[PDB]
């Protein structure tokens, strides 16, 4: 909302104003890599135990 200050002639007569915007969301992502190894899989699995 924008205000008024009432002026005199010969300055034109301004009116109240109203402003409406709506912004759109912008989306992204992140990444990280955990990679394991083979002989490590057999252990945790319980196999080679």
């Amino acid at each position: 909302h924008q205000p008024l200050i009432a002026r005199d002639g010969p300055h034109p007569v301004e009116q109240p104003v109203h402003n409406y915007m709506t912004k759109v969301i912008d989306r992204r992502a992140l990444n990280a890599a955990f990679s394991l190894a083979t002989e490590a899989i057999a252990l945790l699995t319980g196999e080679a135990l």
């Binding site: 924008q2 205000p3 008024l4 200050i5 002026r7 301004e14």
Partner: protein
């Protein structure tokens, strides 16, 4: 009576609030030091006179 009680002087002081404003001592006299274009002339299109 050469010097009368002046009619312009017989009013009681109005009620007074406590307002925030800068007061600067220049020479011997206090002065409101004021720049309006924040309070007024802000976010309207009226130029600052």
């Amino acid at each position: 009576e050469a010097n009368r009680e002046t009619l312009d002087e017989l009013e009681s002081a109005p009620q007074t609030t406590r307002v925030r404003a800068d007061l600067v001592a220049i020479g011997d006299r206090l002065v409101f030091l004021e720049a309006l274009e924040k309070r007024i002339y802000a976010a309207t299109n009226v130029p600052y006179p």
